[PDB]
Design a protein around this ligand. Sequence first.
Ligand SMILES: CCNc1nc2oc(-c3ccc(F)cc3)c(C(=O)NC)c2cc1-c1cccc(C(=O)NC(C)(C)C)c1
Length: 559
Amino acid sequence: SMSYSWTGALITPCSPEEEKLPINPLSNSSLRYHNKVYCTTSKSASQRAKKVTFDRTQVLDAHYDSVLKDIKLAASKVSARLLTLEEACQLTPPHSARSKYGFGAKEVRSLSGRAVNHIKSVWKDLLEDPQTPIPTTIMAKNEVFCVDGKKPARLIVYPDLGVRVCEKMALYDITQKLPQAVMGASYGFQYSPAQRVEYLLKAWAEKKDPMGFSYDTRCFDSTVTERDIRTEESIYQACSLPEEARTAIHSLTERLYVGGPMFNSKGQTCGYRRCRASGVLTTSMGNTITCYVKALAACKAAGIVAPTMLVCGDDLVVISESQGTEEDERNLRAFTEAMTRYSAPPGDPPRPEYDLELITSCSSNVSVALGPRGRRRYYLTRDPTTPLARAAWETVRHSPINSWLGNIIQYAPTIWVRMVLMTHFFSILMVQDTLDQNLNFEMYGSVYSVNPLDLPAIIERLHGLDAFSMHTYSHHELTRVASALRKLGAPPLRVWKSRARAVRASLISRGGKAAVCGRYLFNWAVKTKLKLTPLPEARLLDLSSWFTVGAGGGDIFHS
Ligand SMILES: CCNc1nc2oc(-c3ccc(F)cc3)c(C(=O)NC)c2cc1-c1cccc(C(=O)NC(C)(C)C)c1
């Protein structure tokens, strides 16, 4: 079927949109940034709609059936329960898109009578009716990117707030248990960055002769069929569940997850969806499990030898035994053909790599730097141009996503986070006197609440003490940050190191948790290096909820 059908009504915005920051004609830096950075807006929504609209065909085989059989058997070991209304309301982010039925996230979180009873009606109607399509809203996302032309806006398709709370009651427990039970070590959301690196290094070391590849599906959400989505339901149903959960899961699958009508922000009929919805609770878990099933079946069909997989939504990495370059090339072509028959064709054809550092996935690659010992330390990094361009946009135009914060946390050991992002954002929090204010950052369908003064303990827990003592960065990492700073019109590394010496001194001059930030985060900025010891507060952090899938949008709150 067609991934989408359209009426011709425009995908409309709800808030003001800005494609580019204003130019200062007397600044060369301002011109460089203007030439390089843009924000996607609803103006390009039709270009995206055209790309994501195509017919899907699937040809399954015995390899697919056998993998699916094993997944259902692994799912049967899972016992999951309904969440209470109270639990589902507390998982709702404070600024989650309001309901059309006269209440918002504030009323959901406080359990106001009207919100609670409207959610009661949605729940009862899910139990009563297994078939009527649930309406959704389609919106164009506003995201900042760098040229090299321009990407059109990504589209988000989501149901009403009342429906989103019911999805949590019915399926949140499944999201916490099922992926690990069916995928084991392949489930990408269970790892801290240091644990992810360790897993990849172990997978690489296990092979006598390793070969790795990343596989990127073109428009993954649109390639997801009604059948893939009904198969996801049979996997959820393989769990031990109360009957009421089974009923709600089945109605949500048939009325929402498989497809339905889409409306623009003005309330006009925009189209009809027959693929994955980008803004539902099951988006990330569903994409991860479905990508894993197709990829494991395709490994078997291609004859990939001893594959070790890592799956994060539609991002997939396979590390296996090289059969030599010629056979690897043939086997990757056979893998691609099988993924295409399963309705998962590639954007760019996969390429075999004989060095772990040469694989890119989730925009990241493994790099090496020296520890305080002089020992080689491995960490995840990425090209910093877009993260630095987003941080510059966020400095001038406040966003609740706070991409700069999510980047400082995920990429804490990188040169660009330590020298540029930490220096810049610790300076702004100090000048504004907002260091001790809790902030939220959005990432992979989840909203996390973080105190910037807790960053040293969070970084130590996610990356280890090595994050505060990395030095002697690879030439590629040095060239990458220097080029990104030049291209964006920013001052060079030498200016950032001078500013960091002052930010560190100012932080240490405040005492308490701020001095801890100065000492641990900016130990690279000084000549006389302090010996950094484990932070006791690192062990006391409850970061358990940080290692799971979120809800498209992102609609799972962690505080
Ligand atoms: C470290 C940068 N991010 C990532 N970098 C990555 O690099 C790879 C990768 C790269 C090269 C390669 F050869 C193999 C794999 C990822 C991968 O699994 N691909 C299949 C991958 C995933 C995340 C990622 C995704 C979701 C959440 C979080 C997270 O850490 N989240 C918090 C802070 C909340 C715990 C991090």
